[PDB]
RNA sequence: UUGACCUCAAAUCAGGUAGGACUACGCGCUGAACAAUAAGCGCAGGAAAAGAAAAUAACCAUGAUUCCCUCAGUAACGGUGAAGCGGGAAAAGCUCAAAUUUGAAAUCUGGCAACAUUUCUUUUGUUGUCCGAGUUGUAAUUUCAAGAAGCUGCUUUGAGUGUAGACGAUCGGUCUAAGUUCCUUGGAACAGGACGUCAGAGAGGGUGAGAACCCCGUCUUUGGUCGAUUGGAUAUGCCAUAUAAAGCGCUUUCGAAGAGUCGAGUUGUUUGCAGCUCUAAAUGGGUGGUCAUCUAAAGCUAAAUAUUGGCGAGAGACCGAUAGCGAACAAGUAGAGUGAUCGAAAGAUGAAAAGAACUUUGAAAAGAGAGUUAAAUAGUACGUGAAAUUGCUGAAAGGGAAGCAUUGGAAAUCAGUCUUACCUGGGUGAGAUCAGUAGUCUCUCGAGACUAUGCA
RNA sequence: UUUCAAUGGCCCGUCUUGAAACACGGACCAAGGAGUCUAGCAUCUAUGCGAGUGUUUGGGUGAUGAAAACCCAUCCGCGAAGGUGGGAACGCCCUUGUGGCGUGCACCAUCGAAGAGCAUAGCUGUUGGGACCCGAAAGAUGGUGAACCAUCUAGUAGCUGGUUCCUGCCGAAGUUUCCGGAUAGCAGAAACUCAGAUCAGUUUUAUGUGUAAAAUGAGAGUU
RNA sequence: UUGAGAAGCUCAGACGAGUAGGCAGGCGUGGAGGUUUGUGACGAAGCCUUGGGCGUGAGCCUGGGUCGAACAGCCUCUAGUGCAGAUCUUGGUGGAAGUAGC
RNA sequence: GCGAAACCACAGCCUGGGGAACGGGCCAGGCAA
RNA sequence: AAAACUUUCAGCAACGGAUCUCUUGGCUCUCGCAUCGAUGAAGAACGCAGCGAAAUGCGAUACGUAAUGUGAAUUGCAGAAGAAUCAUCGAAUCUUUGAACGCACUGCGCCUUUGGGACCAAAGGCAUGCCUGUUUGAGUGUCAUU
């Protein structure tokens, strides 16, 4: 119809074709390797989350969920977790424990500067009157507060 | 039945493809079978035609009479066979054309590229 | 439709009433009408007469409704389906459809509508494990799940009585997908099978029974002489 | 000016396909974020309960989640909604608490300089 | 004076950027007919715009925007004609101005030097130094949802560089089942019969007629394999400027909030917007019902949504050469018009050109022989070749009509022909559904199909 | 089949006109060519359900076209807000039949004061939309060299010309009356109640031409 | 007595103009799902023909001649579906006419 | 020798009467070669 | 009354191009994607093939080269035998014009560089507005300034 469409239909140049149409094929899973391995490539995400023990939506389903077979005083209280209903959820949960196990050393050491910084304060103002040792300014060059001085005292221990 | 949306099932579009195809796409459209004993020797079913390939015509008025392929006439999908000719008015020979899917290849022209093609498709010499 | 830019009697003119895309293409039917038409469609696939009268070559089928065991759902090769079909003597249908593969009449075949042929048996399964890829290449044989039975596949052409080949797992689910006239289908919510105008649909039994023929008055001649 | 709904089955499948790529990108987490329970603001529907936009700041603090992290573990925030009735605070705090019961949190690696 | 700082200029001073095109969707200005309508003009993107309340509401209150459904042809107006509500799709939040870093412009472009880096020798960075920008304010910080500052005691952390594998995304090559067996008609077998084979492949097309099995494919492929190019994660090596930076908490200390704007009179436009006349406030100001809600005059922002254009793709109860596009072809083409503009007609020999050698007549054009072909009742004026219309021949008829209808006749021509079979009699040889008979097969004793054997 | 013989028959369509007269349109043949598509409303019928009803905004799903089919969450729309007699049908009889005794639907009289929709499809009707097809100078915007071009435009019509196959049944009115109309009437189409009931472009009888009560016929009356 | 396509078969009587208009049953075209285990190079569709038939009719079936690749009956679905006119559109073709004439 | 356009339902003896023109078709007539 | 002429019907030949069959075209709906130009786009003109009538293709590297493939054809002929009126495609080439750019619109130049064999030729650039910066100078500046 159009001039631009029609001149290249008559010409001899090949058409810039793209065999892109793959209907009915879903998006292959990347990201978490565990779920990818247990991801059925044919089932829909609502079916696969359910088969894997995961909630696709914590919010109300707005429709009619499939029936494949004929199926027969508290603000202080805390919900004591939810046991995993599938092995695959336990696989995800087990990795969470191991990843936290590696990242367990959250205590930091001290560098040389703050090391001798805390010794100079400690050997002069004891070890208990942290407010008084924050009140001094001759040695408290940076003018730290009592709260941060105690943190350095704890961190220097280990 | 076709299931890919990458393929088409259109008489208009498939014929457009057939007669809009260039030579490097026409060289696969013009293929030929292989003789039964040779077909199993290389374990391949059909190979594209080629000049200087010894073939036997199986269909048409020129059924049975053998020869080679003098030159493959790609722009009309024909095979020119020596000694398979026609007497014109002036006594000359206007060699008739046979389509590549009628003849059968008996003796191939063994090129270096053909040998690789045979072993590429899980075959052997 | 036609090009909106493009009188009716003039050459190179605007034909009367330009075809418009907003024509009514899709037609609404109430669901309870659709379930009735499909419960009826399933019922009429168990009556052998309505199967022959639709053109199905089931003169040697061992039994109607034809049910097989669950092992047909685990088929893998279309040699196997032909192996099974030929031992249930249902292959007459497929050999009928193969011989009925004409070329369409008219300008249809110029429009990706090239070939025609009859409809073969219908295989209703319950689980996909290789049945759908076994039987599919067999000409005519259509495979459709129990839970999504389609009226264009149980009443093709509008005509009742398609030859269905159930499986045991699919047949056992029929009591749950449709329900009963008293209970309700577990899978179709609040759906009860239709209740008929009459119980005994055979009238000649209603009339020629004793309880009526004992009270009718005398009988005249069927044809009165002139 | 006339509109036709021929792409209605096309658009629905495009939406489903758009949900599946989202699930692919974010595997463990749900495709949908949690929403609170609120009541429609009219005499006609006031006895109803539906979803809200997000959890107010009193709903986060009472449940025990800071407002900054809540945006990261998928709990959404509504600075505009407020709690006037305690039953509205109660129905949404327990909604958070049941969510944190089923919430597995993947640890993230953290920079640990040699000094401090 | 010097020379600073301010302005003023120029230079082929280096580094740049703007224009025109497209316009289906999109954002503005503007506009008459017949209506934010066409047009006219201006500006963009893969979407544009809009957008985190100076928003509703009177509720158990909701909570950025956008689209859909309803609310609803409702209210209101006077037929025009909504919005909350509700239900869905999608969701994500934010950055400045107003604070003294003042115990230290901590910020940044450009030149130069090396270091790197690449869709890339074509990209994009860092380090060092020098110069400028900047104190008429560039960073950090804070944005009302708060927050600043002091305090407390718990919880936290990379804008690095590799390697390795897994996963994905896009491009490219590649791996891929079975008849061309017999018989008949035909120019040709792809047909009809027969015997087979494959089938995750009986879509479609080609091939000398309808080809699952001759060819391309198709199915396996929701994939193996080999390459490259990248994306977000994992694993792990190295480097970390952390004396640092956050969240929650407690506050005997604090808390800045956008002006020719809002608002009023007045005049245009179509309620807002625009001009003109004036022109404000600080628990104020806007809007709703003494109350409720909101926090304007600054800024950004995905997805849900649109799409008669562009790059491709798949289909159709669509048209089938006077149709469907104006164009199945040399189609905006010839051609028409000073010009803007306007604008057609036109598809099919055959399987193969085998496209008619040659002889002959003719100045040739062409004709006649002759040839090819299955066919020339396919000869390039080429598929079938209708009607109108014209020429030749044969027939009957034919004093200013014709014309048709009935009834026949005549000429001319077709309809359609059928004693043949039935019954009875005998003989002759038979067979079987029959044996004063013997076996197998499938059914349900006997019902079939048969194989012997005898012919009563 | 052609032709002849005897008997016959004013050109078709439109419009006009009681009718014609007419005036139109018709050189011939082929092809093209005109109540269509849609939203709203009401009616009739068919179907599903029935104090209910409606899956298709959307979500779930659909491996063999996956734009189909199949399934249902939250709303929402539209609905929901007593006696007397005549009576359909039935039973009991009992001189049976005749009728009576009853029970009395729909409904109608009387006195009075035990929801029927919703949705889909069709038909006909109506209102809009380019609105059966064709035809009236336009006008406006914007351009080109008073003229001309392109679009808005499917601008406007009570009017003009045309509007396409067969058979069967019924078949008017052609105008009162008030007042462009609402009536009526004629024709139908449905629902009713009766032939033991009413009638009649009827005729008599007779009372005072009207009225009232015998024959001749027909079943008659309603909404 | 076989006469149950109960939508069938059978019996009896009267009747038959028709515009506007109302009602009903059918014939035909393109395509659509079903079907005829339909037809077709031993000749589909089409076309012509004073061949033969069928129907009141719309229409239909068939013989011959040409012809050469497709097509149809039945049940439903569907619509750009039926022509003698519109000084109708397009193409073709006559008389006028070998005339006006050049 | 080269060669239109207009026009065209179809025609073309009248005599009279034929009521509505009727003559261009109908009936009586003659004519009609 | 026969011929001629006029008329009907049949045979045959012209004429015409309907019908029937299809069909590398149209239309319609859905679907995926984001991509022009001062680094010269869209458009136009002139060129170019062993020969093209249109038509495409291409730009003096002209119906294209490099590179990666495929592996022997182009085809009316020619033509070579890594062939190919082939595919892919990341490298170069890409005539005059056109927002169109030295002034003008054919011509006329300017500047610099390269060179020729002081002058000339070729090449390069020489369009305007605006932005960041550099240099140069000037203002009737403000000072500064003993």
Q: Sign of the CA dihedral B58, B61, B67, B68? A: negative
Burial class (CB in 10 A: 0-12, 13-18, 19+), C173: buried
Task: Give the three-state DSSP class for A133.
Answer: helix
CB C124 within 8 A of CB C130: no
CB C167 within 8 A of CB C69: yes
CB A68 within 8 A of CB C186: no
Distance C197 CA to F102 C1' (A): 34
Distance A44 CA to E324 C1' (A): 43
Strand order in the sheet with B66-67: B66-67, B54-56, B104-107
Q: Could you tell me which of B70, B52, B21 has the C-alpha nearest to residue B114?
A: B52
Given the structure tokens 């505009």, which residue do they identify? D80
B touches which chains (3+ CB pairs under 8 A)? A, C
- Kindly state the helix (H) or strand (E) to which residue C166 belongs, with its residue range: strand C164-167
Helices (H) and strands (E) in chain D, counts: 4, 2
Window A:32-61, CB contacts with D under 8 Å: 32, 35-36, 44-45, 49, 54-60
Return all residues near A137 (Cβ < 8 A) that are at least 6 apart.
Answer: A143
Q: How far apart are CA A31 and CA C196, in angstroms?
A: 58
- DSSP letter for each residue of B32-97: EEB-HHHHHHHT-SEEE--TT-EEE--SSTT-S-EE-EEEEEGGGTEEEETT---B-TTS-B---E
Contact B6 A22 (CB under 8 A): yes
CA C64-C65-C66 angle, to 5 degrees, is 85
Distance B60 CA to E187 C1' (A): 9
Given the structure tokens 């995400």, which residue do they identify? A45
Q: How far apart are CA C24 and CA B105, in angstroms?
A: 58
Give the nearest chain B residue to C136 (CA atoms). B1
Q: Could you tell me which of A30, A34, A33 has the C-alpha nearest to residue A84?
A: A34
In this structure, what DSSP letter does residue A31 have? S
B near D: at least 3 beta-carbon pairs less than 8 Å apart: no
Give the nearest chain C residue to A68 (CA atoms). C187
CB C147 within 8 A of CB C185: no
CB C156 within 8 A of CB C117: no
Measured from Cα to the C1' atom, the residue closest to E57 is: D41
Return all residues near B10 (Cβ < 8 A) that are at least 6 apart.
Answer: C112
Nucleotides of E under 7 A from a protein CB: 53, 56-64, 85-94, 145-146, 150-158, 166-171, 174-178, 180-181, 187-190, 198-208, 210-211, 214-223, 231-236, 240-244, 247-249, 294-295, 303-316, 318-320, 322-327, 331-332, 344-345, 351-357, 371-372, 374
CA distance C28 to chain D (A): 15
Task: Give the three-state DSSP class for D90.
Answer: helix
In this structure, what DSSP letter does residue D51 have? E
CB neighbourhood size of B11 (10 A) = 14
Quote the tokens at residue D57: 């700041």
CB B23 within 8 A of CB B77: no
Return all residues near D57 (Cβ < 8 A) that are at least 6 apart.
Answer: D67, D77, D79
Interior/surface letters D39-73, b for 16+ CB within 10 angstroms, e for the rest: beeeeeeeeeeeebebbbeebbebbebeeeebeee
Q: How far apart are CA D48 and CA C76, in angstroms?
A: 54
Q: Could you tell me which of D108, D111, D38, D43 has the C-alpha nearest to residue D78?
A: D38
Return all residues near A119 (Cβ < 8 A) that are at least 6 apart.
Answer: none
CB neighbourhood size of A87 (10 A) = 12
Contact A35 D27 (CB under 8 A): yes
Burial class (CB in 10 A: 0-12, 13-18, 19+), B31: middle
How many residues does this entry show for chain C?
226
Give the nearest chain C residue to A70 (CA atoms). C186
CB C142 within 8 A of CB C97: no
Q: How far apart are CA B71 and CA B76, in angstroms?
A: 12
Contact D116 A57 (CB under 8 A): no
Q: How far apart are CA C58 and CA C89, in angstroms?
A: 8
Please report, to the nearest 10 degrees, the dihedral formed by the alpha carbons of residues A119, A120, A121, A124 taken in order: 110
> For residue C121, what are the CA distances in angstroms to C81, C166, C173?
12, 10, 20
Q: How far apart are CA C48 and CA C55, in angstroms?
A: 11
* CA atoms within 13 A of residue B104's CA, in its CB half-sphere: 14
Suggest the residue from B3, B5, B13, B16 to mutate for an interface test with chain A (most A CBs closer than 10 A): B5
Distance C18 CA to E45 C1' (A): 35
Q: What is the greatest pairwise CA distance in chain A?
A: 96
- Kindly state the helix (H) or strand (E) to which residue D50 belongs, with its residue range: strand D50-51
How many residues does this entry show for chain D?
116
- Kindly state the helix (H) or strand (E) to which residue D18 belongs, with its residue range: helix D8-25
Burial class (CB in 10 A: 0-12, 13-18, 19+), C121: buried
> For residue B6, what are the CA distances in angstroms to A21, B2, B79?
6, 10, 32
Q: How far apart are CA D73 and CA D67, in angstroms?
A: 11
Task: Give the three-state DSSP class for B23.
Answer: helix
Please confirm whether the linkage preceding A149 is cis (ω < 30° from 0): no
Contact A70 C147 (CB under 8 A): no
Task: Give the three-state DSSP class for C129.
Answer: coil
Given the structure tokens 């969470």, which residue do they identify? A96
CB B52 within 8 A of CB B109: yes
CB C86 within 8 A of CB C114: no
CB neighbourhood size of C92 (10 A) = 18
Q: Sign of the CA dihedral C206, C207, C210, C214? A: positive
- Kindly state the helix (H) or strand (E) to which residue A101 belongs, with its residue range: helix A87-102
Label each residue of A39-72 as H, E or C.
Answer: CCCCCCHHHHHHHCCCCCCCCCCCCCCCCCCCCC
> For residue C159, what are the CA distances in angstroms to A43, A122, C34, C123, C141?
35, 100, 15, 18, 18
CB proximity C198–strand F (7 Å threshold) = no
CB C56 within 8 A of CB C91: no
Q: How far apart are CA D56 and CA D51, in angstroms?
A: 13
Quote the tokens at residue B85: 């000719």
CB C50 within 8 A of CB C161: yes
Q: Sign of the CA dihedral D46, D50, D54, D55? A: positive
CB C134 within 8 A of CB C123: no
Quote the tokens at residue A21: 């149409």
Q: Could you tell me which of D68, D36, D72, D75 has the C-alpha nearest to residue D52?
A: D36
In this structure, what DSSP letter does residue C44 have? T
Q: Could you tell me which of C156, C103, D95 has the C-alpha nearest to residue A59?
A: D95
> For residue D63, what are the CA distances in angstroms to B92, C163, D37?
102, 63, 15
**Angle of helix A146-157 versus helix A112-122 axis, rounded to 10:** 110
Q: How far apart are CA D39 and CA D45, in angstroms?
A: 8
Distance D16 CA to E377 C1' (A): 66
Quote the tokens at residue A120: 């100079």
Strand order in the sheet with C142-145: C66-68, C164-167, C122-125, C142-145
Q: How far apart are CA C207 and CA C205, in angstroms?
A: 5
A near D: at least 3 beta-carbon pairs less than 8 Å apart: yes
Write phi, then psi, for D114 (nearest 5 degrees): -60, -45
Contact A22 B22 (CB under 8 A): no
Q: Could you tell me which of D70, D80, D9 has the C-alpha nearest to residue D38?
A: D80
The domain spans of chain B are 1-125
Quote the tokens at residue A86: 């599938």
CB neighbourhood size of C80 (10 A) = 16
Quote the tokens at residue C21: 């895309």
Given the structure tokens 């609040």, which residue do they identify? C190
CA D53-D56-D57 angle, to 5 degrees, is 150
Task: Give the three-state DSSP class for A4.
Answer: helix
> For residue D106, what are the CA distances in angstroms to C69, D63, D109?
48, 21, 10
CB C157 within 8 A of CB C135: no
CB B74 within 8 A of CB B26: yes
CB C48 within 8 A of CB C64: yes
Q: How far apart are CA A117 and CA A115, in angstroms?
A: 5
Burial class (CB in 10 A: 0-12, 13-18, 19+), B38: middle
Quote the tokens at residue A12: 């001899």
- Kindly state the helix (H) or strand (E) to which residue C48 belongs, with its residue range: helix C48-52
């Amino acid at each position: 119809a159009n001039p631009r469409q029609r001149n290249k239909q008559r010409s001899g140049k090949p058409r810039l074709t793209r065999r892109n149409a793959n209907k009915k094929a879903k998006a292959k899973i990347y990201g978490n390797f565990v779920i990818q391995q247990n991801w059925d490539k044919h089932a829909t995400l609502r079916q696969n989350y359910a088969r894997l023990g995961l909630l696709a939506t914590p919010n109300y389903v707005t429709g009619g969920v499939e029936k494949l077979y004929p199926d027969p005083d508290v603000l202080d209280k805390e919900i004591s977790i939810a046991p995993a209903k599938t092995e695959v959820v336990r696989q995800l949960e087990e990795e969470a424990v191991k990843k936290a196990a590696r990242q367990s050393n959250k205590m930091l050491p001290l560098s040389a500067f703050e090391h001798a910084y805390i010794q100079r304060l400690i050997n002069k103002y004891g070890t208990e009157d942290f407010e008084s040792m924050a009140k001094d300014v001759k040695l408290n060059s940076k003018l730290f507060n009592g709260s941060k001085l105690k943190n350095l005292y704890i961190r220097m221990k280990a | 039945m076709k299931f890919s949306r990458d393929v088409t099932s259109s008489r208009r579009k498939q014929r457009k493809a057939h007669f809009g195809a260039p030579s490097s796409v026409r060289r696969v459209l013009m293929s030929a079978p292989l003789s039964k004993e040779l077909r199993e020797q290389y374990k391949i079913r059909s190979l594209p035609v080629r000049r200087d390939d010894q073939i036997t015509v199986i269909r048409g008025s020129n059924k049975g009479r053998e020869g080679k392929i003098t030159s493959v006439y790609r722009k009309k999908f024909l095979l020119l066979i020596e000694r398979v000719t026609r007497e014109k008015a002036n006594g000359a020979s206007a060699p008739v054309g046979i389509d590549a899917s009628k003849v059968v290849i008996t003796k191939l022209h063994l090129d270096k590229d053909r040998k690789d093609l045979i072993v590429r498709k899980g075959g052997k010499v | 439709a036609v090009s909106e830019k493009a009188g009716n009697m003039c050459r190179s003119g605007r034909m009367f009433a330009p075809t418009k895309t907003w024509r009514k293409w899709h037609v609404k039917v109430n669901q309870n009408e659709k379930r009735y038409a499909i419960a009826s469609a399933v019922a009429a696939s168990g009556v052998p007469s309505l199967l022959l009268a639709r053109g199905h070559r089931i003169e040697e089928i061992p039994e109607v409704p034809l049910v097989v065991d669950d092992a047909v759902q685990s088929f893998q090769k279309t040699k196997e389906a032909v192996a099974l079909l030929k031992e249930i003597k249902a292959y007459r249908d497929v050999i009928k459809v193969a011989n009925s593969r004409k070329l369409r009449a008219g300008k249809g075949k110029l429009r990706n509508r090239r070939h025609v042929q009859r409809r073969g048996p219908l295989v209703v399964f319950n689980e996909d494990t290789g049945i759908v890829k076994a039987f599919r290449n067999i000409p005519g044989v259509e495979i459709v799940n129990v839970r999504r039975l389609n009226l264009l596949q149980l009443a093709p052409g509008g005509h009742l009585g398609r030859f269905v080949i159930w499986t045991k797992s699919a047949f056992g689910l029929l009591d749950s997908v449709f329900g009963s006239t008293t209970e309700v289908a577990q899978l179709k919510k609040n759906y009860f099978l239709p209740e008929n105008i009459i119980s005994n649909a055979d009238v000649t039994r209603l009339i020629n029974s004793d309880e009526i023929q004992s009270i009718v008055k005398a009988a005249g001649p069927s044809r009165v002489k002139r | 000016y006339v509109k036709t709904w021929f792409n209605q089955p096309g658009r629905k499948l495009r939406r489903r396909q758009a949900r599946q790529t989202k699930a692919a990108k974010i595997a463990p987490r749900p495709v949908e974020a949690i929403r609170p329970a609120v009541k429609p603001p009219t005499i006609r529907y006031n006895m109803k309960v539906r979803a809200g936009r997000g959890f107010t700041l009193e709903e986060l603090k009472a449940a025990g989640v800071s407002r900054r992290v809540a945006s990261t573990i998928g709990i959404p925030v509504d600075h505009r909604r407020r709690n006037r009735s305690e039953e509205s605070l109660q129905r949404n705090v327990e909604r958070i608490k049941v969510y944190l019961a089923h919430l597995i949190v993947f640890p993230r690696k953290a920079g640990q300089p040699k000094k401090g």
